[PDB]
Amino acid sequence: GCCSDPRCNMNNPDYC
Amino acid sequence: GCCSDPRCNMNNPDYC
C-alpha cells in the first residue's frame, strides 16, 4: 500500500 | 512539504 510506505505517504496527503 | 512542489501539489488538489 501507498500510505504504509513512508515516501509514498509523504507525497500523497489527499489519501494518506 | 508536498504542496510546495508543483507536481505534488497538482497530484493532491484536496489538501493542497
From Swiss-Prot, chains A, B:
Post-translational modifications reported in the UniProt record: Both tyrosine sulfation and C-terminal amidation are important for activity and structure stability.
Top-rank lineage group of the source organism: Eukaryota
Disulfide bridge partners, by residue number: C2-C8, C3-C16
Official protein name in the record: Alpha-conotoxin EpI
Entry text on domains: The cysteine framework is I (CC-C-C). Alpha4/7 pattern.
Modification Cysteine amide, positions: C16
Naturally occurring in which organism (per UniProt): Conus episcopatus (Bishop's cone)
Recorded family membership: Belongs to the conotoxin A superfamily.
Sulfotyrosine sites (modified residues): Y15
Misc remark: Does not show activity on alpha-7/CHRNA7 nAChR.
Region called Ser-Xaa-Pro motif, crucial for potent interaction with nAChR, residue ranges: 4-6
Subcellular location: Secreted
Expressed in which tissues: Expressed by the venom duct.
Covered residues, full protein: 40 to 55 of 56
The protein's role, per its UniProt record: Alpha-conotoxins act on postsynaptic membranes, they bind to the nicotinic acetylcholine receptors (nAChR) and thus inhibit them. This native peptide blocks mammalian nicotinic acetylcholine receptors composed of alpha-3-beta-2/CHRNA3-CHRNB2 and alpha-3-beta-4/CHRNA3-CHRNB4 subunits.
